[PDB]
Amino acid sequence: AKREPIHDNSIRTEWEAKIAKLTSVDQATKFIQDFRLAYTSPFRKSYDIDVDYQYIERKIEEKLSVLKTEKLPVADLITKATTGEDAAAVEATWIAKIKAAKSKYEAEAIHIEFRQLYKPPVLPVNVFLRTDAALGTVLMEIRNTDYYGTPLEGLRKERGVKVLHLQ
Amino acid sequence: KRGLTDPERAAIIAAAVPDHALDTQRKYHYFIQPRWKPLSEYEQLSCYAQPNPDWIAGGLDWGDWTQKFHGGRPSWGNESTELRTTDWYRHRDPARRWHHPYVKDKSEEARYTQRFLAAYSSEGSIRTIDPYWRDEILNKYFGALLYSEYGLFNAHSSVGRDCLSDTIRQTAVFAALDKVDNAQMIQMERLFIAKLVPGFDASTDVPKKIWTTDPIYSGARATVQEIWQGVQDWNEILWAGHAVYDATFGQFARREFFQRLATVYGDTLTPFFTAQSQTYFQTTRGAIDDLFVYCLANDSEFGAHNRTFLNAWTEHYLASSVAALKDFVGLYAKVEKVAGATDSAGVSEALQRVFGDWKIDYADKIGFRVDVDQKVDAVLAGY
Amino acid sequence: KRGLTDPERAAIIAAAVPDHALDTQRKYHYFIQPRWKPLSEYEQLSCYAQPNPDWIAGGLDWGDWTQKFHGGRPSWGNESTELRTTDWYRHRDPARRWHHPYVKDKSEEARYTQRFLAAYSSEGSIRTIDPYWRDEILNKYFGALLYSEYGLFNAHSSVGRDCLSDTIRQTAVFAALDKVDNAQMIQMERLFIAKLVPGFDASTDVPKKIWTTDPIYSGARATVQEIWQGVQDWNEILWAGHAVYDATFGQFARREFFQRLATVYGDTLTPFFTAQSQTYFQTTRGAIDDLFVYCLANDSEFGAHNRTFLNAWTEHYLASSVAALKDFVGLYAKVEKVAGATDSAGVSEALQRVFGDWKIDYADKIGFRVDVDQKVDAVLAGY
């Protein structure tokens, strides 16, 4: 449609009106989790707030994070995910799935979702980074193996694209 | 055939140039918000060099990056730290150091040090240092310590790649180079000694073994490995290493141990080196203080938020260093008991000083409650 | 309208310039006789700048001057010294210092010193210095000593006007500035202290009184006034001040007294300053040594001749300094007797070192017989 100004438009305004209403950490965690499944990664639900999601997300991150410092006890901020899950458990879990992945297309989804679900402030910074890092090495290895094997035509179909035009 | 000095070309360019300026704003990046009274050159050449987008507090660009890591980790992102802020650019190093001023200064230190060394050897001033201090303490435990500095230097690699602003970046990098310098300089004194006192083994074999297996440096090696490899939150690495670990144990080891006791065992060589490490410390301090106290701990919107993590990290890492110190005070057992320096009380005031400054230098600025008395007692137990 | 960048003029000059060089000798003053392997820039920019005529050994001009003093004293003449030589230009400073290198180095020291000072105060390192050392000794007798340096600095004015060659001139002048620097720096430490320890009077009133009326500095003041105002033979001033007086008493006072005892009374501030004075000494030494040992004491035609005067001056001025020292060793009475430094034996090795180096550094080079043992005994009598 018609675009509005980059850094100030009705969309970021409205989501901010929304974020403002969150009050519980539980509350804030579902919200941000729903927000990232719906709007981030090429496997996003919607592409509607495409040019505004990243700013909005950051604003939600802020709300969640502030909430945690004033509600969860200090220890939890270090030892666990906002979901009440034990940070190491989550790490153990996802590093297990990725290792169990049988294809690159299977590997990518595990990595992409881990982020949507656990990007800080949901998961502690130190925990998220190493896990993200560990998942990343696997995906890369699964992927860079025989990289030029499949022809373009084949790749197009494995990706499941709707080829609208070839010159 | 250059256009400036070639008749036919200079003439041609002369005709193309307009008689008047096409704008009067001549301040390079005039839109930078000055910290001081008017825009500095340090600011003008540093501020906004990092292409951050609006979704990262402070940045002026827009859109997503053009290439992320596999899985989507952003080139730079808010996942790198738990600390939040109104503008990541807010940071200003009190020294206004950009690359030029920084190497210029060190270059002075570089050359002066070699002049001083050539004279000192011609001076034969080595003749009166205490042989035990020289051979047993200096050569071994002072050598060992280079590994503490080297460790801290290394805990900056990821910081260097992960921080969210240019100024912090430079503050971070000049910090790292100063630490590898300390390491390099401690060895330089060791090598100079070898050239002067025959049989003095300046190699790192013994100081290396001591670091990794000698109980005196046990807690330190513990803290260091944890700061270096333990975490990736770039603010946590910066805080814990400089504001806590070095401010305490490092400062105690350098100023209170080696430099102080050097001026009691008649050692006129070591204070020359410690002068540099101690100056370097104070310089990083101003930068570290601005970033954490001014910028972070006092961010209008996230002060209390960041302080939660600051006080958290502080309680964790201070405990680690109290232990580091407790292991360190075992070294006193190997020195001559000078009445009032290497004795219980002497050593106790050394601690008093350390914990006492840290309390006004860092603690009180961030709202961390510390009972200096208790911490001295704590360290002293391993005496 | 500059000729380099103005089209019509650059064009005009372009036409006037020849297509080839009009000579291939491009070494500036290629006829200078190199000391080292090939001509240095220090040589090229210094050698032959003084317009000496052939009647003054080494000079390449001819005729009398164009204006003398009333009565006929030449602008420069052979009456200025008793020392004779084959070429007055023969002298080369080992540091090859011309004006640029010289200020460049000091400029480093200048800036580094202010960095160090700003850190040291923030470091609170002053807290552990011995109060007696600080208040009684340092503040008074160390202050007093600036007058020794200042005296030596002044004994160079006539030298500056009367020496017969450019290199000697520069060696002479950089020597003088280094001495007034010492004086200025001793006071700087005194002023820094005042800013840190309340009630510390950094003024010169007391150190001044001590110099002029305190028996400890009696012989020194005697020697200094005699070198400064006593004579006008520029080589005699140079020799006596640097090669004898400073090499002995000065060196003893700075290295053996203040710097050494600073590293025993827990003083981490003074060695910073003495590092400069001690380096400066060693630099002048190389210059002084070249001029007197290489150039003069060993001149193919007048070696034995000049050595006659050298050994003469040496016997006279050494006696003066032995006395200077004998007065100086009275200060020990005011310090805590550290077993092996401030006691008879401790002090005796200090002397041993001084007289011992001087013997190999200067004595033996000029054929002066000195029984180090006797001189130590001599000084020690006033202990």
Next chain:
Amino acid sequence: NRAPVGVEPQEVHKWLQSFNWDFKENRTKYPTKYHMANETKEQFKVIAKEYARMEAAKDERQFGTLLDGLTRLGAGNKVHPRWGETMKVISNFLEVGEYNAIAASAMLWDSATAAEQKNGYLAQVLDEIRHTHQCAFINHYYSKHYHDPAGHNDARRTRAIGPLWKGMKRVFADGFISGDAVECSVNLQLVGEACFTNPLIVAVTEWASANGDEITPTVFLSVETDELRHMANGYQTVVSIANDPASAKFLNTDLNNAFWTQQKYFTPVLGYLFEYGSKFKVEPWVKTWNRWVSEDWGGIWIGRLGKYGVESPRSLRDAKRDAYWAHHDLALAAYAMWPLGFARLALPDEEDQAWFEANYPGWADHYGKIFNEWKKLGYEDPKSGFIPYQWLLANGHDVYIDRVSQVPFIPSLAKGTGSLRVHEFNGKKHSLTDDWGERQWLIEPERYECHNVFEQYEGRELSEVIAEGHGVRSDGKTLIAQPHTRGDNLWTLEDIKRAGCVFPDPLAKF
């Protein structure tokens, strides 16, 4: 033992490798398919004090020349206006590549396990800070003395407005820090500095001095001196991983991906900035490119690494095809969309044309005709209300941005080797322009989600976009950028506004 002795830097460097110590957790933090050897050695025995000493000396001579001599000469206003304007983009764009390198090389010092190896990178880290501040100094100085300081005085903000900025970001920002340290390494060191920067920084001083610019040669001649250590850092990267089984599988894959990334933007952009941002030509780009890429690099530099099972990129032949016309294809897109820049352009004059046709037979009939056509249409006159972008649209020539490289594409006027592929995926359309990036996107959909200028500016009138992004000068009405480099008839917001240019979604017809 009283003899004048000091300690030499190589004496210290002798113990560096022993500075590191073992412990179970002493490993890199970044995701990577490689493991750099632990006893890898560095090539230059430099240390801290020595680093500072070596660089400061350079600094002194450089700053003496600009600050002292050149100011006295009035040099900053002796450059030709075209080149003066090109230096806004050249210096600021580079500044970013220098900037991101500080971070990239830090990731590399993190990757390395050998003390010595971290040392080389750390050295590079300091070098990159120096070069960022040097690139800023060029624009800073130009702000002070050039006839047009606007653009030079704010590109770190005015670059965000137009398309060319995004490409530069891919190669010199994202390509250096996002991904496998090694890919980031090959991207920066082995291809970036080794194939491009290094010869580029020298070629720039040639194009500069030739157009009255003596600011740039002063600064860059200094820069290139530190770059040799960087070429060495790439070299050491391969070496440290040469016995890693992974390398046999992965290395060459990353190297070809890294190489195409670099050539993609650089091939067309530098040729464009040289040939069009100059009045006085130094040599034609097509010839330069074959000596840099085809010969010096693929030929000589790469061969020296062949003993590591490292080969010439498989995309080299594809690159070569493009080198002739790709930059002229870009020129059209650049001139056309001139109001989105921060620099004043100039159409190729009657003689620039002659040089063009002489060095690229065929240029005239195709590019020449369009450029002249636009000139007649009122390209430079603010009263014409004519913008080449609208003429592009009206005559069926659509501009697409490649979802991977960001490089613009006009298939209907393109002579280069690329082509369009528009795919739909999860409800989003994507324009790809070559086989290599199409594969990159097909395989790594989530590494490539960068929004484009059309996506962002859709349905907006060009002046509104410019005013919002600050493309105006001190008076807040007149545009920094211009279609001519004269000193009169400067276009304003109203002028732009009268053309009624509104951003369309080029992918809506598919």
Next chain:
Amino acid sequence: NRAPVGVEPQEVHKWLQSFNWDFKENRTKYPTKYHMANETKEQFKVIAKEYARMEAAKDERQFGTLLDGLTRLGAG
């Protein structure tokens, strides 16, 4: 008292006049019909370290220009 403080050149220059001391033989060696006052004051408060610092800076810019820029221009 931990606060960053240094000593300024004018602070040092403040004690220079007291550096000289009296003694019957403290007089010029040259023949002259004049006697310069003993409390005469200087106009620029410079000192050694400061002298060096001030000049070197000049030197740096000068030598950068000739050695670097002008050579590159073929100016000579």
